[PDB]
Structure 1
Amino acid sequence: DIAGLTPCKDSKAFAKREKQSVKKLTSSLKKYAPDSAPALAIQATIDKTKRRFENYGKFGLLCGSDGLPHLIVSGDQRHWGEFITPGVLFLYIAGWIGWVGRSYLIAVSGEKKPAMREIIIDVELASKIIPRGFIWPVAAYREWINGDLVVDDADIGY
């Protein structure tokens, strides 16, 4: 397939690795009583391992000659679940955090001693600003349009 890689659901090395891990777990499982707690924990680990391999196989990942999954990040539409969609989620969350921080700093700077409100948080004020990160992409865009996001170079100084 892409870059000489093979789908993990059809890779012999992938199945070999799964079998080796399951055998290694079963060798430890064969040391305890069937109804003891360690046996149940090892059995749960075995079931989890089988589920992990099955999900990797059926989610469309690609495997190399080593028998391990590899990620594709060039933009191909068959692999957006690997980088692009989680990346959009990361950007959304990070923008929320940054936007609420900047809005708190701007709202608090008008007081007599703003620094006192930076080592002791005003939770009453922050609890009104936290929910507003929900629409940060709209607010930031509108603020950029109207020229409220950036300070002119002439005005920057201590």
Structure 2
Amino acid sequence: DIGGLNPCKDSEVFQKRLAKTVKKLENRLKKYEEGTPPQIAIQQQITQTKQRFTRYADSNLLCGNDGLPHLITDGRWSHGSEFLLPSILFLYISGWIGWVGRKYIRTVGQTSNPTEKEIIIDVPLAISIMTSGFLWPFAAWQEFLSGDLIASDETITTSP
């Protein structure tokens, strides 16, 4: 399909990889005894390996000639769960972190001892700001509009 890849559900090398891993795990399982915790752990390993391979097969995942899932990150929504949705999730979380950090910096920057409140965090104010970051996309595009997001010329510059 895309880039010459093929779905992993029809990739023979993918099933060969699964079979080889299961065979190695079973051979390891053979050298232990009865329902002893080592055998239980190896059986859990086998079950998890089978579940992971089955989930990857039924996941709209494209496999190359090596039988490994390749990620299609050109931007198409068909393979949108590989990069685009995790990209949105990370952008949300990281914007949350950056927004709460910036808000805390600007909030304790207007107190008597701004530097003290950076090594000794005001946990009440920190908790107040941190749970308010869920609106960071909206807060950012409400502070940029008001001109409160960017400094203009009070920023310092070197000699040249």
TM-score normalized by structure 2? 0.95
In 1, Cα distance between equivalents of 2:77 and 2:155: 45
Q: Deviations over 1:58-98 (max 9, x none)?
A: 01101011111100011122100000010000000000000
In 1, Cα distance between equivalents of 2:3 and 2:156: 53
In 1, Cα distance between equivalents of 2:124 and 2:39: 51
Counting only pairs closer than 5 Å after superposition, residues 66-85 of structure 1 correspond to structure 2 as 66-85=66-85
Q: State the SS of the aligned residue for 1:145.
A: coil
In 2, Cα distance between equivalents of 1:107 and 1:91: 24
Offset at residue 29 of structure 1 (A): 0.5
What amino acid maps onto 2:41 in structure 1?
A
In 1, Cα distance between equivalents of 2:7 and 2:94: 33
**1:32 matched to which residue of 2?**
32
Offset at residue 116 of structure 1 (A): 0.8
Offset at residue 109 of structure 1 (A): 1.0
TM-score normalized by structure 1? 0.96
Q: State the SS of the aligned residue for 2:144.
A: helix
In 1, Cα distance between equivalents of 2:147 and 2:119: 30
**Pair 1:141 & 2:154 matched:** no
In 2, Cα distance between equivalents of 1:124 and 1:5: 53
**Structure with the bigger percentage of helix:** 1
Structure 1 residues not aligned, in runs of 5+: none
Offset at residue 112 of structure 1 (A): 2.0
How many residue pairs are counted as aligned between the two chains? 157
In 1, Cα distance between equivalents of 2:129 and 2:34: 56
In 2, Cα distance between equivalents of 1:155 and 1:41: 63
In 1, Cα distance between equivalents of 2:71 and 2:77: 13
In 2, Cα distance between equivalents of 1:7 and 1:63: 6
Offset at residue 33 of structure 1 (A): 1.2
What amino acid maps onto 1:157 in structure 2?
I
What amino acid maps onto 1:150 in structure 2?
I
Q: Deviations over 1:2-50 (max 9, x none)?
A: 1111100001100111100000000010111121110111000000000
**1:157 matched to which residue of 2?**
156
What amino acid maps onto 1:155 in structure 2?
E
- CA RMSD in angstroms comes to 1.1
**Pair 1:127 & 2:134 matched:** no
**2:65 matched to which residue of 1?**
65
Q: State the SS of the aligned residue for 1:156.
A: coil
In 1, Cα distance between equivalents of 2:98 and 2:26: 49
